[PDB]
Structures are given as C-alpha cells and as structure tokens.
C-alpha cells in the first residue's frame, strides 16, 4: 500500500511479515480539508 508493487502474493504469512494491530472498544485532515468553504458570501452580479 505504500511503495509496493508485486502482483503475487507474499511467501510469508502476514503475521510474520508485519506486526498485527489490535482494536479497542484521511481521518481528521481529510475531513477538515473537505469541509473548506468554497463559495462566495456576497450577492454575485454577472
């Protein structure tokens, strides 16, 4: 997903190639950038 480009599958299990993530219970700057105001604010003329 970063800079990787092999089409075939890894020879090693995922549990050996990477650490495994656990859960408890572009996220913020993406939401922030999408919420930007892109309008006008006056009355427009022509």
């Amino acid at each position: 997903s970063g800079n990787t480009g092999s089409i075939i599958n890894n020879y090693y299990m995922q549990q050996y190639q990477n650490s495994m993530d656990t859960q408890l219970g572009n996220d913020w700057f993406s939401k922030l950038a999408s919420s930007a105001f892109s309008g006008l604010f006056g009355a427009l003329l022509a």
């Binding site: 009355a43 427009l44 022509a46």
Partner: protein, 210 residues
C-alpha cells in the same frame, strides 16, 4: 460597527467586491436594445475579451470643495488594453457601461457626493446641477457607504457609433455637501472609478498601417 451589504461584480476575469453596497442603479433600461440592425449588414461581432474592468483616478475630495464642484469623465476614455485597441481596428462600435465609483475615507467623515451617468453631456450649468438626479445616479455618503454602482446601456441617435468623434456618456461626480473630517475622519478622500464596457460589438474592419 461595519456592514453586511456585500456585493461581488464579475466582468470577465476581473471581479470587484464591496462590503458597503447600497445596490446597483440600472439607468434607462434593463437590457440593451437590438444590436443587429440594417446599418451593419450583419457584419458586426461581439468581442467578449474587452468586457472587463479598467481603472482611473477621478479627483481628490477635499474640505475646500463646495456644493457644485464637479468632475466629468467622457466615455469611452483612453484605454491601453483590448477595448482600446478595438477602437483602432473597427470603424463602428457600441457597448454599455458597468460603473463602480469608490470614495473611501471612513465613517467619521461627513459630506456627500452624487455620482451620475449623463448622456450627451456637452457641459452643465450651475442651476442644472439641482436636477442632476434626473440622470441614472447613486449617492456616496460616508456614514453609509463607500461605493456607488450604476449600469447603463448604449444610447444614441445611431445604433452603432464612431467613438473617435462622439462620446455618448459622461460619468459625473458632484459634491452635494462638503466633506467634513472632524477629529476621526480621513483627511481627504481620493475618488477612483472601476469601469467595464458591456456588450461590446464592432463592425467595419480598418486596414493596418503597413
């Protein structure tokens, strides 16, 4: 303290925004009359690239000017851009005007300017200034606003003009009440115009000088 009367005018790739708006005065009509008549034999064309804002200083409103002090600007005026070159390439043209006049001091100034677009203004008499409001106009009054905006169509005894010999419109700015500065006012106000030709049509292409 300051205001939400907020307008953006866009003419071509140029825009102008004021926050002290008051609105726009449309003079004599809301749209241009027929741009194609018998006098150009279907040879006229629109040149959209000239429809954009150009700028000129008009005068500096100072406390010594009194009622009746005037500044006139005949239109078209010198233009060093594509509208200006149109007048050297075509024998006949017509366009209206979208006019924005600005006088910025601050809200602690007093006094009042009338800005008007007058047709065929071969100069004005003093008593006639009391009736300048017969022409498309707007006031600039510092406690309220800083911008006047007037939009006017092409007018004239002829459907297309020869601007090298006839000027159909004169912008006039008149002091109706003298500027006061008091202790917080700006000490004088420079008046500037931001003007765009509208609907420009040309006909009758000239030779070059080659």
């Amino acid at each position: 303290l300051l205001e939400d009367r907020i307008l953006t005018t866009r003419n071509g790739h140029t825009t102008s925004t004021t926050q002290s708006s008051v609105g726009v005065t449309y003079g004599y009509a809301t749209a241009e009359d027929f741009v194609s008549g018998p006098n150009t034999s279907g040879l006229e064309t629109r040149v959209v690239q000239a429809e954009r804002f150009f700028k000129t200083h008009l005068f500096d409103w100072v406390t010594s000017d009194s009622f009746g002090r005037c500044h006139l600007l005949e239109l078209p005026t010198d233009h060093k851009g594509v509208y200006g070159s149109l007048t050297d390439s075509y024998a006949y043209m017509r366009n209206g005007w979208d006019v924005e006049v600005t006088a910025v001091g601050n809200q602690f100034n007093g006094g009042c300017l009338l800005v008007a677009m007058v047709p065929e203004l071969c100069s004005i008499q003093k008593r006639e200034l009391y009736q300048l409001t017969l022409f498309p106009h707007q006031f600039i009054n510092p406690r309220t606003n800083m911008t006047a905006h007037i939009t006017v169509p092409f007018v004239g005894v002829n459907r297309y003009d020869q601007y090298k010999v006839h000027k159909p419109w004169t912008l006039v700015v008149m002091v109706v009440a003298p500027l006061t500065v008091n202790t917080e006012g700006a000490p004088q106000i420079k008046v500037y115009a931001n003007i765009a030709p509208t609907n420009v049509h040309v006909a009758g292409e000239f030779p070059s000088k080659e």
